[PDB]
């Protein structure tokens, strides 16, 4: 369920899966998002709410941010601890 | 209260009486009877001279 989300600003909706690709919660789920700014512009990411409660260990649930295209080349940050820095 | 420290009922290093005396003290505290004795002896002489 890779989805586009580009422009000047926007809110990656909290658990936006019920309408894009309504998946059963029993199976493991994951959906990626692609962001593009205006021409000649970088991006600042600031979390407004984030709580991966079910563990403080990350083999199951987490959120990650990669720089550039959606490849493994250089992980900007995968964040699992209670708080989440801006990037 | 600047500092805290309690009182007790001393018994030798080995005594099968300590467990039951502890049970009894916790009992009395749950019924609050020792508070009644305290008020009988501290408050009992406590306020006969309300100024």
């Amino acid at each position: 369920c890779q989805f586009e989300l580009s422009g000047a600003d926007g809110i990656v909706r909290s658990s936006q899966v019920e309408q894009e690709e309504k998946t059963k919660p029993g199976q493991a789920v994951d959906c990626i998002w692609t962001i593009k700014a205006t021409p000649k512009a970088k991006i600042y990411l600031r979390f407004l709410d984030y709580q991966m409660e079910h563990s403080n260990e990350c083999k199951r649930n987490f959120v990650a941010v990669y720089d550039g295209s959606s490849a493994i080349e250089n992980l900007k940050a995968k964040f699992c601890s209670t708080v989440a820095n801006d990037v | 209260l600047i500092d805290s420290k309690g009182y007790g009922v001393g018994t030798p290093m080995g005594s099968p009486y300590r467990d039951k005396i502890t049970i009894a003290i916790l009992q009395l505290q749950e019924e609050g009877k020792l508070h009644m004795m305290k008020e009988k002896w501290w408050r009992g002489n406590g306020c006969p001279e309300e100024e």
């Binding site: - | 019924e31 609050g32 508070h35 009644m36």
Partner: protein
């Protein structure tokens, strides 16, 4: 003097004052540990409380 250095004081200042007042409408946690004490407490200074 009053309008310069003003010190306001509490209406109630003791546990007993909560009883025999019938205007503050106090409370407690539902059947936690406080209710357990107020139940069966036979000092009767808190039996009005529980009533």
């Amino acid at each position: 003097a009053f309008l310069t250095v003003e010190r306001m004081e509490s209406p109630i200042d003791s546990a007993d004052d909560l009883a025999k007042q019938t205007k503050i409408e106090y409370g407690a946690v539902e059947d936690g540990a406080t209710m357990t004490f107020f139940k069966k407490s036979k000092i009767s200074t808190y039996d009005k409380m529980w009533a």
